Ligand binder design. Structure first.
Ligand SMILES: CCCCCCCCCCCCCCCCCC(=O)OC[C@H](CO[C@@H]1O[C@H](CO[C@H]2O[C@H](CO)[C@H](O)[C@H](O)[C@H]2O)[C@H](O)[C@H](O)[C@H]1O)OC(=O)CCCCCCCCCCCCCCCCC
Ligand code: CLA
Ligand code: CLA
Ligand code: CLA
Ligand code: CLA
Ligand SMILES: CC(C)=CCC/C(C)=C/CC/C(C)=C/CC/C(C)=C/CC/C(C)=C/CC/C(C)=C/CC/C(C)=C/CC/C(C)=C/CC/C(C)=C/CC1=CC(=O)C(C)=C(C)C1=O
Ligand SMILES: CCCCCCCCCCCCCCCCCC(=O)OC[C@H](CO[C@@H]1O[C@H](CO)[C@H](O)[C@H](O)[C@H]1O)OC(=O)CCCCCCCCCCCCCCCCC
Ligand SMILES: CCCCCCCCCCCCCCCC(=O)OC[C@H](CO[C@@H]1O[C@H](CS(=O)(=O)O)[C@@H](O)[C@H](O)[C@H]1O)OC(=O)CCCCCCCCCCCCCCC
Ligand SMILES: CCCCCCCCCCCCCCCC(=O)OC[C@H](COP(=O)(O)OC[C@@H](O)CO)OC(=O)CCCCCCCCCCCCCCC
Ligand code: HEC
Ligand SMILES: CC1=C(/C=C/C(C)=C/C=C/C(C)=C/C=C/C=C(C)/C=C/C=C(C)/C=C/C2=C(C)CCCC2(C)C)C(C)(C)CCC1
Ligand code: OEY
Ligand SMILES: [Cl-]
Ligand SMILES: [Cl-]
Ligand SMILES: [Fe+2]
Lengths: 244, 170, 30, 36, 202, 33, 97, 50, 137, 334, 32
């Protein structure tokens, strides 16, 4: 009785992670002898917050809300990885593969577009020790990598890039170039982000779980052009476990 | 294509005035021929309206009054003076060619309207700033480097592959 | 100031249109 | 948004039926020479 | 070498490098020339002397290609980096200056070397004062450029004046319109042996 | 945008001077009639 | 201090040899017996501490360990340049013909 | 950097009487991401032009 | 210049034997190449995998070597990956696979010679353009 | 005197300074809507991700554009040919990023412009005129349909319809030549012939009539005041004009029938522009201009280049640079 | 001197605009 592509196409439900019945308050137990992989991890954002820059010092600006403008293009899904048991009984998911990045641009008040690479690339996420079962109180905390929003071939609007393109401001042939080093030399940033996944629904029969996540990372820095903004993302998630 | 890649001739206001005169002429040509043909008097009995002209007749062969009312109500303004009308058909295409002649004279000297300085300063400093003006110069840059060695053989241009401007994949 | 200039000239044109049509010299027969 | 959509649908349909019924009201007869 | 002579050997003084709406004096573009920097000599890592292909007047932008006395490309500044064989970094290009403000100095670090390579395409290499007039860095044409342009344009415009006023001299009797009692016999064919001469009726 | 400052006076005069000439001649035309 | 890391890597061994940690997979066609099978394997198990580390790739048939030896002299390893490995650019770097 | 420091003449008269936010999502009270409906600074301006 | 024996002379096998095509064979093979191959191999590139081309120096480095008639005719019968490690008749037109590539059916053995003849002579006339791509059009 | 009949009589009245008509009932609202959206967007719209690669292109004046560079940018490639009214966006902000204004403007303009043509038929009926002025207008209307609708349909995306601005126009016609070799297409060549021809004949006809004005004025007054609006007599001498042009060339190459001459003036630019609008419409399905790249080779088989091959080198430079970040695979098949 | 550069346009229209008004009124007087 699964839905069919043609039932889904054009509805928006393709951007939506699967849901667990509001009755599924079980637990999944962990045989340290057996191994386990996460067959499918689906991360569905619902809220996008950006840290303001408060000009002065002791004020520390707030996380402010934003409007999404890139439409229903935001979900990570089909992610998979090892699920290990450590000495002290924690588990650790290690990402491997999956559609583990989506570009997103949100808009602050006043019109500033903030683009970002929402991602869990290379994610490693562990639990407390002495789990022995995945329950409606298990918490997964971890960190992932945030590569550069644009990759190396990306040519800016004057033809300038890192692995391709011009190295100078060719329309200003005898301008002094020391002014333009920031804009002429492209950089490939690589930063970390942090995620927390909270389990709140568990089907003991099927191995599926679901719940909420919060992650923090940096926005696009336009290959060194400017400075990044800090970004907090909230949403929901779904994952399915198998005895690999 | 040479004048697009090297002179950016489409951006030159003396060419733009040429375009408005050539196309304006063609407009005027079609619209005046079609107006006359559909404001004709019925001077013969048969369905071919051509037979019913006589080269020597003093009487006009279409109605300037019904033409003027038609266009006043479709378009808001219309000709009322047949001499001004036909003189305007002379004036419009003649002048546009004259304006483009002037522009090409500038280009004899590489005096192009190639750039808008304000645009270049911003785009140099602001890599998120893109317009159709910047996109078209990339294309001009493509044309120059790809056609020049073959098109100017006497310059022995040798452009190894690595120096050619190319976007991704293409 | 560029923007103000561009749009002021454009707006003058639209007003000329208005007077050219409704306040035209009215063609008089013969 | 849903309010706007209805509004536009309504406005359009209105002008369309104006058009269909405008021409269904003896348009061949609105000419200066011969009327039927 | 006197600086006055080396300054002539630089494309920013080429009148054919300007633009119709790049206004003002040449100094508004590259700045006020202060000092000849010296004549740049490029050597690859094998110590061959390399020669920057100079930019022709036609080209707003031009690539950086170094060659040997025989004309053979040995280095360049590549656009696509992934398959590049001639890069200054691979070929260990260096720049040494002889004469001028920089006489006797060699630079090896590839970004400095390239930067002078970018100027060599313009010919000899000068230091300019860009702040004093807030120079935008874009070549203007010289008074040679402006005088030629204006006089060529006027000359052509005046040809139409010649035509107009000349027409009006030979045809003044019809300026206001042809004769209303012109008969179609003067104008139809075969009527007069000679065209317009009424004394030649057959 | 860093734009030529005389652009404004140039555009303003480019319009006002020829436009005023035409108006002067129209208005002293109406007063004849 | 604002370097273009790709240029600056053209002035290491990366600019003269196939760099087992950074070079795109299509370079493995310049020497024989290396593409596609071994090249695939070299890249998945990147990066490498030294050039000879490729002989310890698990699964290699003695024929394959022979071809790699025949070509140890055309390899190098430099530090991984993120800009060259991210985006899966070692399988497809935007360059065709 | 309030409005009176920036040379604003008419902005404080719209604000005097209840108009305080913009279709861009800001409000002169400092509050970010806000929805004012039509009677923002922009709509007031638009309506004087109609 | 013209189509002379030297240029029409190509290697037969790796031993270094040679064979000299007739002009007739050259035009024959050019024709068959357009009919069976150019939809992917115009100009000596490979549109569906540009990393592998028909330049003689690429063929020489293929396993087995393919800069000769024998190697080329074998490839049209039983094509392999560039290293030789897997047969690929399933995704590359071949006689071994002519059931599923119907054009390869009416090709006779001499037809294959002419095709292989063309591939090896053309780089000698066009030089860099053969397998160069758009940069040399 | 019934309320509907009286409305119908206003709509179709020959007495309104501007004629309305049943066609005018659709045209007025759709043109006012396209017009107002365009004027606002040109001045103030934020940048648009035309090519769907999250690389927005600034088109309006307030974002650093001038009269020459500004445009209402076409809608995102990500939308392709999907309908995208305001009510399908989560918000105006989304709608603006993805280029909704362009769709709104073009659909309303195409409609109102269609009804414009029909309105020309209509008033011609109400005034007892012949009917075909509108046939003449269909040549430009067909042109607008080809670049705003037909071309996008066949390439699969409105991102590839013609931008609404001066430099965007040139961008559209540069990319077009790289992808279609339109100069080497015979229907564009007939457009140039239609368009050059039209300017030529306009100047000819204008100069021939002007040359043969009958003297009705003094030197101190405009010749134009020799015509009075609605006078019954012609204001120039057509046989004196035929007399001069027959001899400038030869007799039979000159019209002495003003009906054929004016019909000729109408047919030439109309027909040629039909063809060149058909040229854009068939190149929408990628039936491209003649391709003679390498059509000439020597006895050995060297390529001997012609001007076609030079053209192609420049087409190549257009090809490899356009939309420089948007292609991941080696052929630009759309 | 570091002067106000909108002073030129201000002086310019200050002169031209009221000046133009008066010329217009004088000429259409002379022609009746
Ligand atoms: C000449 C002769 C012919 C006659 C002439 C007739 C004269 C009439 C002239 C028409 C004048 C129209 C003026 C243009 C209107 C466009 C205004 C707009 O689009 O304004 C709409 C405003 C704009 O909303 C805000 O629009 C904003 C857009 O921001 C943008 O704009 C900002 C500054 O503008 C910043 O730049 C920012 O960065 C940028 O993103 C944000 O997205 C906000 O979220 C959003 O609230 O919406 C609102 O709340 C307003 C109400 C809509 C809310 C939803 C309710 C739906 C109501 C249905 C409307 C029916 C219409 C009536 C028809 C009925 C017929 C009987
Ligand atoms: C909408 C598109 C458009 C339009 C309408 C025009 C219109 C024009 N262009 Mg531009 N052009 C465009 C797009 C367009 N252009 C683009 C996109 C580019 C790329 C940059 C160009 C590049 C371009 C160049 C490079 C030039 C123009 C020129 C011109 C003008 C041509 C004048 C003319 O009549 O020449 C026709 C030629 C003549 C009238 C000269 C003499 C003709 C004699 C009398 C011919 C006699 C023939 C003889 C009797 C025998 C005939 C028989 C024979 C064939 C066998 C005209 C103003 C030209 C120009 O500006 O001129 C100064 C010019 O050189 N255009
Ligand atoms: C032949 C005449 C001539 C020539 C060649 C020059 C040349 C020069 N002058 Mg001098 N100048 C002249 C006349 C001339 N001037 C006159 C008459 C004046 C008094 C108005 C001046 C006032 C003057 C000043 C105040 C300055 C110069 C300066 C300069 C230099 C830079 C000029 C520049 O940027 O060009 C710019 C040229 C253009 C932007 C082209 C303008 C042409 C327009 C666009 C054409 C109009 C088209 C028309 C409307 C089309 C419609 C026609 C259709 C409807 C029928 C250069 C050496 C400058 C300098 O560096 O001195 C130190 C400087 O500051 N000049
Ligand atoms: C003659 C009147 C007329 C016509 C033909 C259109 C036609 C259109 N409008 Mg416009 N529009 C109009 C008046 C009109 N409009 C007015 C007066 C306003 C302001 C109130 C608008 C405001 C408006 C907006 C805001 C939008 C449109 C849109 C549209 C398109 C989709 C309409 C739709 O789904 O209808 C469906 C209904 C039918 C087919 C009815 C069929 C009934 C039969 C008997 C279409 C091109 C949308 C658009 O362009 O998206 C691209 C859009 O976003 N219109
Ligand atoms: C001298 C060289 C030359 C010449 C003469 C031309 C001539 C032409 N070109 Mg070519 N072209 C050239 C060079 C040249 N081109 C080059 C170098 C290239 C490659 C870079 C091209 C690429 C090219 C393309 C890609 C296209 C052309 C098109 C055309 C035609 C444009 C005129 C037209 O479409 O009318 C058609 C008429 C219209 C578009 C008018 C529409 C009018 C609407 C209905 C009303 C508008 C209302 C308005 C907005 C408001 C008015 C109201 C007022 C109150 C404001 C014409 C035949 C175009 C064409 O064929 O289109 C069919 C086209 O798309 N050319
Ligand atoms: C919000 C903002 C600011 C938006 C800005 C939008 C935008 C981008 C605008 C850009 C504006 C822009 C830059 C435009 C520039 C155009 C430009 C290049 C200008 C040309 C300049 C110029 C002087 C060039 C020289 C050539 C020249 C003289 C051409 C003139 C063209 C022209 C006016 C031709 C006539 C066309 C016209 C439609 C006439 C129709 C005549 C008509 C009423 C005929 C009807 C008729 C026919 C009959 O037969 C009879 C018998 C009767 C009786 C009769 O009535
Ligand atoms: C009557 C009174 C009203 C007349 C003025 C009307 C305004 C017309 C404006 C036209 C000039 C537009 C120039 C704008 C640029 C400007 O403002 O910069 C102002 C520039 C001066 O340039 C300034 O110079 C400064 C140091 O001197 C600095 O360099 C500034 O940065 C630089 O802008 O003006 C010119 O130099 C003016 C002289 C131009 C005249 C010679 C050109 C001849 C070319 C032949 C033209 C014939 C074509 C015939 C076609 C028909
Ligand atoms: C093996 C090949 C087979 C053949 C090829 C098939 C294709 C050919 C199809 C064409 C059929 C020709 C019919 C044309 C006759 C006709 O139009 O008469 C109409 C009038 C009547 O003539 C007038 O005739 C009148 C008398 S009557 O109407 O004929 O009775 C008379 O009063 C008047 O003075 C006289 O001038 O003639 C003209 O006005 C001449 C104008 C030429 C019109 C051609 C259209 C131009 C299109 C070119 C566009 C180019 C753009 C680039
Ligand atoms: C609802 C549908 C109606 C659509 C509304 C659009 C109306 C706009 C039409 C023009 C009004 C202004 C004409 C003024 C001038 C005017 O009043 O002319 C009136 C004039 C009347 O000519 P007559 O023959 O009466 O004059 C002869 C003698 O009186 C003069 O010596 O018209 C002509 O000369 C026709 C040629 C002008 C055609 C020029 C049209 C170009 C206009 C468009 C260009 C605008 C570009 C702007 C860029 C933003
Ligand atoms: C597309 C459908 C093709 C057609 C038709 C033909 N070939 Fe091809 N060829 C194609 C591909 C994708 C490949 C790569 C194979 C791989 O290794 O993965 C090839 C390869 C060749 C080669 C080898 C070139 C080399 O550098 O080693 C040759 C010699 C070759 N193909 C020849 C060839 C001939 C003669 C064809 C017509 C009869 C032909 N191919 C058709 C794709 C396609
Ligand atoms: C104050 C101010 C300012 C200034 C401003 C100005 C400069 C103004 C202008 C204004 C303008 C300049 C105005 C305009 C006007 C116009 C009009 C208002 C128009 C009209 C038109 C119309 C009404 C139309 C009509 C029609 C119709 C209805 C139908 C069809 C036809 C036509 C189209 C004709 C500034 C900004 C600096 C600042 C702030 C304040
Ligand atoms: O021509 Mn080239 O092809 Ca028709 O798409 Mn593929 O690239 Mn892109 O979007 Mn506009 O442009
Ligand atoms: Cl582009
Ligand atoms: Cl692609
Ligand atoms: Fe006429």
């Amino acid at each position: 009785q699964t839905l069919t592509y043609d039932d889904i196409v054009g509805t928006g439900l393709a951007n939506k992670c699967p849901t667990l019945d509001d009755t599924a308050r079980g637990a999944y137990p962990i045989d340290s002898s057996q191994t386990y992989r996460i067959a499918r991890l689906c991360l569905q954002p619902t809220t996008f917050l950006v840290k303001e820059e408060p000009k002065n010092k002791r004020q520390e600006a707030e996380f402010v809300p934003t409007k999404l403008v890139t439409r229903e293009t935001t979900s990570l899904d089909q992610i998979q990885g090892e699920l290990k048991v450590n000495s002290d009984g924690s588990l650790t998911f290690v990402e491997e593969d999956g559609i583990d990045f989506q570009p997103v641009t949100v808009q602050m008040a006043g019109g500033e577009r903030i683009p970002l690479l929402f991602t869990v690339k290379n994610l490693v996420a562990s639990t407390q020790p002495n789990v022995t079962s995945i329950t409606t109180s298990t918490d997964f905390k971890g960190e992932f990598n945030v590569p550069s929003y644009r990759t190396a071939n990306f040519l800016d609007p004057k033809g300038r890039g890192l692995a391709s393109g011009y190295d100078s401001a060719i329309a200003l042939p005898q301008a002094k170039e020391e002014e333009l080093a920031r804009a002429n030399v492209k950089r490939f940033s690589l930063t970390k982000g942090q995620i927390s996944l909270n389990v709140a629904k568990v089907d003991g029969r099927t191995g599926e779980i679901a719940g909420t996540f919060e992650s923090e990372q940096l926005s696009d820095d336009d290959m060194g052009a400017h400075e990044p903004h800090e970004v907090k993302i909230q949403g929901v998630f779904y994952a399915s476990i198998e005895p690999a | 294509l040479f004048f697009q890649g090297f002179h950016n001739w489409t951006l030159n206001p003396f060419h733009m005035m040429g375009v408005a005169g050539v196309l304006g002429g063609a407009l005027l040509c079609a619209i005046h021929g079609a107006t006359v043909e559909n404001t004709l008097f019925q001077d013969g009995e048969g369905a071919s309206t051509f037979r019913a002209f006589n080269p020597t007749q003093a009487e006009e062969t279409y109605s300037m009054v019904t033409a003027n009312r038609f266009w006043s109500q479709i378009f808001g303004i219309a000709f009322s003076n047949k001499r001004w009308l036909h003189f305007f058909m002379l004036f419009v295409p003649v002048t546009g060619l004259w304006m483009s002649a002037i522009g090409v004279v500038g280009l004899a000297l590489n005096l192009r309207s190639y750039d808008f300085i304000s645009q270049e300063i911003r785009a140099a400093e602001d890599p998120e700033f893109e317009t159709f003006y910047t996109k078209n110069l990339l294309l001009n840059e493509g044309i120059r480097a790809w056609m020049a060695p073959q098109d100017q053989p006497h310059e022995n241009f040798v452009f190894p592959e690595e120096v050619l401007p190319r976007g991704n994949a293409l | 100031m560029e923007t103000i200039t561009y749009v002021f000239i454009f707006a003058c044109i639209i007003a000329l249109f208005f007077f050219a049509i409704f306040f035209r010299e009215p063609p008089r027969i013969t | 948004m849903e309010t706007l959509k209805i509004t536009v649908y309504i406005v359009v349909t209105f002008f369309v039926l104006l058009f269909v019924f405008g021409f269904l009201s003896g348009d061949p007869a609105r000419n200066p020479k011969r009327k039927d | 070498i006197p600086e006055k002579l080396a300054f002539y050997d630089y494309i920013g003084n080429n009148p054919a490098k300007g633009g119709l709406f790049r206004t003002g004096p040449m100094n508004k573009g590259d700045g006020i020339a202060q000092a000849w920097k010296g004549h740049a000599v490029f050597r690859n890592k094998e110590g061959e002397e390399l020669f920057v292909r100079r930019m022709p007047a036609f080209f707003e932008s031009f690539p950086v290609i170094l060659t040997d006395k025989n004309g053979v490309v040995k280095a360049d500044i590549p656009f696509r980096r992934a398959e590049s064989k001639y890069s200054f970094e691979q070929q260990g290009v260096t720049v040494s200056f002889y004469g001028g403000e920089l006489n006797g100095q060699t630079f090896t670090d590839p970004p400095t070397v390239k930067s002078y390579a970018r100027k060599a395409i313009f010919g000899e290499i000068f230091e300019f004062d860009t702040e004093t007039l807030n120079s935008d860095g874009i070549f203007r044409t010289s008074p040679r450029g402006w005088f030629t342009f204006a006089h060529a344009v006027f000359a052509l415009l005046f040809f139409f004046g010649h035509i107009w006023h000349g027409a009006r001299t030979l045809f003044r009797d019809v300026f206001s319109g042809i004769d209303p009692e012109l008969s179609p016999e003067q104008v139809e064919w075969g009527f007069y042996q000679k065209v317009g001469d009424v004394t030649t009726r057959r | 945008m860093e734009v030529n400052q005389l652009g404004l006076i140039a555009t303003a005069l480019f319009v006002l001077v020829p436009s005023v000439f035409l108006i002067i001649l129209y208005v002293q035309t109406e007063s004849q009639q | 201090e604002l370097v273009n890391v790709v240029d600056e890597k053209l002035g290491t061994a990366y600019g003269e040899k196939i760099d087992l940690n950074n070079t795109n997979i299509a370079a493995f066609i310049q020497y024989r017996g290396l593409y596609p099978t071994l090249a695939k394997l070299i890249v998945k198990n990147a990066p490498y501490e030294s050039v000879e580390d490729v002989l310890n790739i698990p699964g290699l048939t003695e024929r394959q360990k022979q071809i790699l030896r025949e070509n140890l002299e055309h390899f190098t390893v430099t530090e991984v340049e993120t800009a060259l490995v991210e985006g899966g650019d070692r399988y497809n770097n935007g360059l065709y013909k | 950097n309030p409005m009176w420091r920036q040379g604003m003449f008419v902005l404080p008269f719209m604000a005097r009487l209840g108009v305080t936010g913009s279709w861009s999502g800001w409000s002169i009270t400092g509050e970010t991401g806000i929805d004012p409906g039509f009677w923002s600074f922009e709509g007031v301006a638009l309506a004087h032009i109609v | 210049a013209e189509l002379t024996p030297e240029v029409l002379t190509v290697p037969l096998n790796s031993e270094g034997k040679t064979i000299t095509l007739t002009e007739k064979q050259y035009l024959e093979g050019k024709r068959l190449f357009q009919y069976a191959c150019a939809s992917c191999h115009v100009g000596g590139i490979t549109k569906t995998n540009p990393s592998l081309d028909l330049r003689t120096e690429t063929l020489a480095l293929a396993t087995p070597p393919r800069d000769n008639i024998e190697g080329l005719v074998d490839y049209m019968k039983n094509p392999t990956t560039y290293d030789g490690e897997q047969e690929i008749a399933e995704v590359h037109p071949s006689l071994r696979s002519a059931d599923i590539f119907p054009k390869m059916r009416n090709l006779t053995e001499k037809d294959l010679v002419a095709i292989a003849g063309h591939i090896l002579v053309e780089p000698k006339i066009l030089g860099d353009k053969w397998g160069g791509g758009k940069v040399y059009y | 005197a019934n309320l509907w009949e009286r409305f119908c009589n206003w709509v179709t009245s020959t007495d309104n300074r501007l004629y309305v008509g049943w066609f005018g009932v659709i045209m007025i609202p759709t043109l006012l809507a396209a017009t107002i959206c365009f004027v606002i967007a040109f001045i103030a719209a934020p940048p648009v991700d035309i090519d769907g690669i999250r690389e927005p292109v600034s088109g309006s004046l307030l974002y650093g554009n001038n009269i020459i560079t500004g445009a209402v940018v076409p809608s995102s490639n990500a939308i392709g040919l999907h309908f995208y009214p305001i009510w399908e966006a989560a918000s105006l902000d989304e709608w603006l990023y993805n280029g909704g204004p362009y769709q709104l403007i073009i659909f309303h303009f195409l409609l109102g412009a269609s009804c414009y043509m029909g309105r020309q038929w209509e008033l011609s009926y109400r005034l007892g005129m012949r009917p075909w002025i509108c046939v003449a207008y269909s040549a430009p209307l067909a042109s607008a349909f080809a670049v705003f609708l037909i071309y996008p349909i066949g390439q699969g995306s409105f991102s590839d319809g013609m931008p609404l601005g001066i430099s965007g126009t040139f961008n559209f016609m540069i990319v077009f030549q790289a992808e279609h070799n339109i100069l080497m297409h015979p229907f564009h060549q007939l457009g140039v012939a239609g368009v050059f021809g039209g300017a030529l004949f306009c100047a000819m006809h204008g100069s021939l009539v002007t040359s043969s004005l009958i003297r009705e004025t003094t030197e101190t007054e405009s010749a134009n005041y020799g015509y009075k609006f609605g006078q019954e007599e012609e204001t120039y001498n057509i046989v004196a004009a035929h007399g001069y042009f027959g001899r400038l060339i030869f007799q039979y190459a000159s019209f002495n029938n003003s009906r054929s001459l004016h019909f000729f003036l109408a047919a030439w630019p109309v027909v040629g522009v039909w063809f060149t609008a058909l040229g854009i419409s068939t190149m929408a399905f990628n039936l491209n201009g003649f391709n003679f790249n390498h059509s000439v080779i020597d006895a050995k088989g060297n390529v001997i280049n012609t001007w076609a091959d030079i053209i192609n080198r420049a087409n190549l430079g257009m090809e490899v640079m356009h939309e420089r970040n948007a292609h991941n695979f080696p052929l630009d098949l759309a």
